[PDB]
TrEMBL record, chain C:
This is TcdA1. It comes from the Bacteria. The lineage of its organism: Bacteria, Pseudomonadati, Pseudomonadota, Gammaproteobacteria, Enterobacterales. It comes from Photorhabdus luminescens (Xenorhabdus luminescens).
From TrEMBL, chain D:
This is TcdA1. The gene is tcdA. It comes from Photorhabdus luminescens. Residues 19-143 form the Tc toxin complex TcA C-terminal TcB-binding domain. It comes from the Bacteria. The chain holds residues 2372 to 2516 of 2516 of the full protein.
Length: 149, 97, 38, 145, 48
């Protein structure tokens, strides 16, 4: 299905992102989710027995936090959850989505880069591992993450 | 096929290189930037090929590496063309005032 | 289906002739290096 | 033949070229005749007294505008250092290699010197310094055989 | 050959690396690298 548009031949994508798209699609292929955000929200939400249990948007928001040592609206999104007080507010991965997204939309370009860095790396780790344990067809012996590569 | 090839010597300062970058590449003062990076743990400036970054190698996580594309030195324009189409480094010396 | 390239070298003949000649009319010798001949 | 003009080449419309006939240097008269009839350049160095600030290098070259010898009659000497220099990095005689301009009779010929990127209206890296440079000194070494 | 002799002066990329720079993980060059103003590179490229 790949497009030979010039756009595809020029703009330089960080890899480990193109891959991440591949893995999100390979995941959504099975269980027929409503959107990718349902794949990271859902799979990354509760998926025990491995690091896969880690949530994506939690990483995107904790990366905003990574951004500062410590509009007030976004502050109502981060105070909207409760990491340091009131345990965890347990907002839905929706409100995580708006929270982290809003928090980044006001953030600098270079730090936006490094957040794509750490974000894309970890997201690759989880999507890889989950693609290992399931969604990897038992027909191809798959096993380690390299043999996945 | 070997003719005496006229030698040119050209200083280039990196301060001017990084400052002179177009805005998209994020031009930057070198002194301030460097001092920030050593002051903190990591960070970079600069475009993808002109950046000043910390090293990603096993050894050299600490080593500070400052990389300059030539294509932005525009050395081809410090002379006419047609004077010599092939232009090739004789050597490079470094001064770190 | 993808379209062919422009074939420089053969054009390089044209623009190199234009260059040489330009250097003759303007008395510039073989490079641009100017000459004063008798 | 002594003029100071802008260059007419495709590249070098901006390059300022300043050309000096030798026949007006009357070098043949700085000695007796009959001491040596053949008098021939050993090399030429160029000094461009000027304020070239750190860190900046002058850019210029020396053609020769007539038929002599050497390599295709074309040997530039690329003035960069700006102080009492020659196109060679580490200059040495007795090297086995001719020095550029070695062999030019000191009467015939024409000697031109070209600063590239001179003209200011079309912005030019050397316009400023070339406003500042006072004048050109050329050190000729010509062995009288 | 001298190192870099032969590099076309357009293509390529030139990088310069001070080891042991970063101060938080203690580093012998952190201090001076705070002090150094800027880098000057002297290129000698023969036009053939």
């Amino acid at each position: 299905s790949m497009a030979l548009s010039q756009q595809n031949m020029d703009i330089e994508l960080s890899t480990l992102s193109l891959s991440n798209e591949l893995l999100l699609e390979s995941i959504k292929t099975e269980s027929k989710l409503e959107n990718y955000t349902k794949v990271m929200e859902m799979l990354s939400t509760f998926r025990p027995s491995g690091a896969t249990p880690y949530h994506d948007a939690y990483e995107n928001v904790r990366e905003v936090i990574q951004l500062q040592d410590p509009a007030p609206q976004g502050v109502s999104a981060l105070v909207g959850l409760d990491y340091i007080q009131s345990m965890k507010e347990t907002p839905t991965y929706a409100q995580w989505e708006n929270a982290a997204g809003v928090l980044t939309a006001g953030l600098n370009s270079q730090q936006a880069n490094t957040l794509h860095a750490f974000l894309d790396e970890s997201r690759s780790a989880a999507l890889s591992t989950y693609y290992i344990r399931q969604v990897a067809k038992a027909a191809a012996a798959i096993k380690s993450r390299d043999d996945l590569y | 096929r070997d003719k005496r090839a006229l030698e040119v010597e050209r200083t280039v300062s990196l301060a001017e290189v990084y400052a002179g970058l177009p805005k998209d590449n994020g031009p930057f003062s070198l002194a301030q930037e460097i001092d920030k990076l050593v002051s903190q743990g990591s960070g970079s400036a600069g475009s993808g090929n002109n950046n000043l970054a910390f090293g990603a190698g096993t050894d050299t996580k600490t080593s500070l590496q400052a990389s300059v594309s030539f294509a932005d030195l525009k050395i081809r324009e410090d002379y006419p063309a047609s004077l010599g189409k092939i232009r090739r480094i004789k050597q490079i010396s470094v001064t770190l005032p | 289906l993808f379209l062919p390239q422009i074939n420089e070298v053969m054009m390089n003949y044209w623009q190199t002739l234009a260059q040489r000649v330009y250097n003759l009319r303007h008395n510039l010798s073989i490079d641009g290096q100017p000459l004063y001949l008798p | 033949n002594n003029n100071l003009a802008f260059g007419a080449g495709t590249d070098t419309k901006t390059s300022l070229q300043a050309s000096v006939s030798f026949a007006d240097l009357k070098i043949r008269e700085d000695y007796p005749a009959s001491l040596g009839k053949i008098r021939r350049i050993k090399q030429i160095s160029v000094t461009l007294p000027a304020l070239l600030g750190p860190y900046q290098d002058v850019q210029a070259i020396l053609s020769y505008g007539d038929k002599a010898g050497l390599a295709n009659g074309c040997e530039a000497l690329a003035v960069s250092h700006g102080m009492n220099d020659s196109g060679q990095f580490q200059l040495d005689f007795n090297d086995g290699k001719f020095l550029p301009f070695e062999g030019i009779a000191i009467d015939q010929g024409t000697l031109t010197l070209s600063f590239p990127n001179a003209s200011m209206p079309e912005k030019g890296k050397q316009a400023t310094m070339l406003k500042t440079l006072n004048d050109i000194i050329l050190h000729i070494r010509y062995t009288i055989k």
